[PDB]
Structure formats: C-alpha cells, structure tokens
C-alpha cells in the first residue's frame, strides 16, 4: 500500500484524474498530496491515536512510492478523509453522498481503536476479611493505581 | 452455485445503468478493474465492523481477477452490490436516487438481521449458589465460576 | 394454472408500462433473463427476513430459466411482482409513483399477515406446579419442564 496508491484513490473518487481521463494532473500536484498525507498523519497521531504509519526517516522528503505501513483494512477511511481536506484545493465542493461515505468509513476506523479505560479502586478502600488478608494475601487495603 | 467478482461488479454497474446490456452496448475494462479493486478494499474494510461473512481475499500478492470465485452465498450479493454501487457512484458523478437508497437500506438491514449474536449476561463470580442446589453431592460448588468452567481435568489451567 | 418466473417478470414489466403485449416496441431477452436472475437472487435473500413461502430454487449447477415453475401460490404474485418492480426500476433509471408505492405496501402487508406467527412464553422451569394439580399421582412433575 504505497503512499501513491492512497493519493490515486482520492483523486479518482472525485474524478479529478483517473487511468481513463484523456487529461491528467501534473506530477507536481501528486507530490503535494504525499506531503498532505504526512500532515494528516502527524495530526492523526493526536486525536485518533497512532495507527502504524511509518513516517519518513530523518532528513528525507517523503516519496510517492515509499511504503506507508497502514493495513488495507484502514485504506478506504484514510483516503476518504484526505479527499475532503484537499478537495477544496481544485476549487470544488463535496457532495452529501461523499460526506456520508467518509463519515461511515471514519466510524468503521474508530470502532477498531476503543479504549474503555476501566477505572480501578481508589486506594484507601478497605479489603474485607472475606479475602483473608492475614493468610492468603498480604495487602489489607487496595494497592492503588499502578503509578507510572 | 458460484459467485464471481466480475458478475458482482457487472450487477453493480447494471443496477444504475452505467454500462447495461439493453440501453448501452459497451462495458469498459477500466470500469471493471476499478470496480473489482473497490470491492476488494470494501471487503477488507467490512472484515471488522459487520463481521466476516465468508469472503475470500487474494492469497499471495497478485491482483484479483474478475474470473475468480468470491465464495459469498447468493443471499448476500444484493447487499454487497448495492453498498458497492453507493461507494463508486462519485467517479461517474451521478448522485443516487431515494429508491436506490431505500433498497440498499433494506438489503443491509436484512444482512444485519442474519448476522446477529445478542450475547447473554454471565454470572458475576462471587454470587452465591443457593443451598437448594445440593452442593457436596452434585458438581456445583458454593459459588458460580464466573469464567468458563473446567470441562476435562486433563487441561485444567483453562 | 401454475405461476412461473417468466409470468412474474412479465407482470412486473407490464405494471409500469415498460413493455407489454399491446406495445409496438419490445425488449430483448437479455433484459428478461436479467429480470429472472434478479428474481432468483431476491427470493433467495428472502429466506431470512420474511421467511419461507415455498419458492423452488435452481437445483445446484443448473441456471434458472423462465419457463420453469416457481411453485408459489397465486396469492403472493402481486407482492413478488411489486417488490421486483421496485428493485428493477433503477435499471431503467425511473422513479416509482406514490400510488405504486402504496399498492406495494398494501400487498406486502398482506404477505406479512399470511406469514405472521407469534410465540408463547413457556414457564421458567423452576416454577412450582402447585398442590392442586395432583403432582403426587396425576402428574409426575413438581416443577414445570420448561422449554424443549
């Protein structure tokens, strides 16, 4: 799943260019799309969380043929979002069907990264004599929150 | 009998008359390739949220071909084709119709009904078993296991 | 009189005036076989939500042909035809009318009325039977058997 494939999906879905169009977008435009994917992933490190994207090494510009490392399960979701971000570049506006597809793919991606933090006991809560803290277990109160 | 990705893509195209067999006498191989790739990617995405339904992905690394067998039962093909049609309609810049949306909704709802689980609520684990359950004679103990109970004894860790 | 897949498809085509006996223009058999295929897949999918209505499917390898008999009674003909019409109008890129929608809804409600069956909740299984049922002599149960 090279970075270039993700960019090609974005342009084909809104029809700007395709392996069919008599016309085609210049090479410079594709580089901007690869650079936009990297800003996308840099931001996605924060809100959606880490996914497994392999960023460029120190002091190399990203290349369209470079490996990305995201599994093909998340490909539709990553591609649809990028299209919305760079759609306005070509002076266009998205459609409700495209918006719904992107939203559904985003929910599908989010369903794969749940947390459910499952908060623990306070730390001063007593442990009853039913646990037999005298013999079987040393602690007479809950251990705490596992610091750092 | 057998479901082929080529015929699924052809059904998706025909249901919106992008390339039919009555109105138009043309089918485009570029459209076929785009459709089959979209079907592959969409099935890969579907592998998580709706759950596996028996689709077979391309082994190795060579690209899928329309002549291969999908392996899907014939009762899912309408839902698959509709959901594919909605996803690929942007390329020809044709907006969908409310009747098509309703049909896709009903097909997807039927698939959802077919693929339900509705799990039950197991016992907590410290909840006592009643005195009338005859422990010390039956297999039951004073308390519920709260985990899958031992089935053999040769494998006792789980 | 025995209903056939070809008869159902012809009824569905006629009811919205796409093709009929009186028309001076007629559609190729490719459209007819596409319609019968659509009927076959729709009725095979109908095995889960509405239930079983007695439809006869192709015997494995063999493809469906219009001349064979489906086995459905005359009652379900309008329901099946209207559903096929609603699923097939998009092929010719048309829009169903409100009267057609209402008629299809009425016939589908009739189909649900025919198919409907409601269950009964059996006793839990630890429910006492009572001393008045003569569980000492007349009945061997002190508690209800439960679901079978």
């Amino acid at each position: 799943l090279t970075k270039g494939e993700i960019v090609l999906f974005a342009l084909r879905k809104f029809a700007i260019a395709s392996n069919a169009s008599l016309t085609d977008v210049e090479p410079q435009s594709i580089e901007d799309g690869v650079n936009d994917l990297e800003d996308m992933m840099s931001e996605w490190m924060i809100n959606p969380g880490d996914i497994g994207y392999a960023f460029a090494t120190g002091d190399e510009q990203p290349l369209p043929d470079d490996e990305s490392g995201l599994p093909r399960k998340y490909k539709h979701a990553v591609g649809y979002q990028l299209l919305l971000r760079m759609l306005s570049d070509y002076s266009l506006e998205p459609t409700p069907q495209v918006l719904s597809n992107a939203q559904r793919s985003y929910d599908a991606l989010m369903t794969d990264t749940l947390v459910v933090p499952s908060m623990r006991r306070r730390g001063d809560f007593p442990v009853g004599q039913g646990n037999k803290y005298d013999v079987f277990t040393s602690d007479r109160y809950y251990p705490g929150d596992l610091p750092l | 009998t057998v479901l082929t990705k080529g015929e699924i893509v052809l059904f998706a195209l025909r249901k919106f008359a992008i390339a039919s067999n009555a109105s138009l006498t043309d089918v485009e191989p570029q459209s076929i390739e785009d459709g089959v790739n979209d079907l592959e990617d969409m099935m890969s995405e579907w592998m998580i949220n709706p759950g596996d339904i028996g689709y077979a992905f391309a082994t190795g690394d060579e690209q899928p071909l329309p002549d291969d067998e999908s392996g899907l039962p014939r009762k899912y093909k309408h839902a698959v084709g509709y959901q594919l049609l909605l996803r690929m309609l942007s390329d020809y810049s044709l907006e969908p119709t409310p009747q098509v949306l309703s049909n896709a909704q009903r097909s997807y709802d039927a698939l959802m009904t077919d693929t339900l689980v509705v799990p039950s609520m197991r016992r907590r684990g410290d909840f006592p078993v009643g005195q009338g359950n005859k422990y010390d004679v039956f297999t039951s103990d004073r308390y519920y296991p709260g985990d899958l109970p031992l089935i053999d004894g040769d494998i006792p860790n789980a | 009189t025995v209903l056939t897949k070809g008869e159902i498809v012809l009824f569905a085509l006629r009811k919205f005036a796409i093709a009929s006996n009186a028309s001076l223009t007629d559609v190729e058999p490719q459209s007819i076989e596409d319609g019968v295929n659509d009927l076959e897949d729709m009725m095979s999918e109908w095995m889960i939500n509405p239930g079983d209505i007695g439809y006869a499917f192709a015997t494995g390898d063999e493809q469906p042909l219009p001349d064979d008999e489906s086995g459905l009674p005359r009652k379900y003909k309008h329901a099946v035809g209207y559903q096929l019409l609603l699923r097939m109008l998009s092929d010719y890129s048309l829009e169903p009318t409100p009267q057609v929608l209402s008629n299809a809804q009425r016939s589908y409600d009739a189909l649900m009325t025919d198919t409907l069956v409601v269950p009964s909740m059996r006793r839990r299984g630890d429910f006492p039977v009572g001393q008045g049922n003569k569980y000492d002599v007349f009945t061997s149960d002190r508690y209800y058997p439960g679901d079978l």
Binding site: - | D141, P145, L150, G153, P156 | -
Partner: protein
C-alpha cells in the same frame, strides 16, 4: 564502578578493554559441585493450588 554514584561501588576498578579473564576448571570435566551460601541468598516457595468444581 559508578563515578557519579560512588556509594554503590563493589569493585576496585572498572573493567576496561583488553583486560585478562580466565575460566575456572578444565576443558570438559564433569563433577558434582559443593555449595556454600547465606540464609538470605535464595528463596523457595510452593504456592497452593485451588480446588475445582
């Protein structure tokens, strides 16, 4: 041998490169070794196992 924390030194000098090392014993001898130790060298426990259904 920690220069920043001299509190925990347990050897006269650091092990630099090229130091001389040796292996105590013989090439392929087999023997039964005798032991010596303190009370708090090792600890052994046998944790109980729970009953089943």
């Amino acid at each position: 041998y920690d220069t920043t924390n001299p509190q925990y030194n347990s050897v006269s000098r650091q092990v630099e490169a090229g130091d001389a090392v040796s292996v105590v014993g013989t090439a392929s001898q087999t023997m039964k070794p005798n032991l010596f130790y303190n009370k708090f060298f090792c600890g052994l426990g046998s944790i109980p196992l729970p009953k089943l259904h």
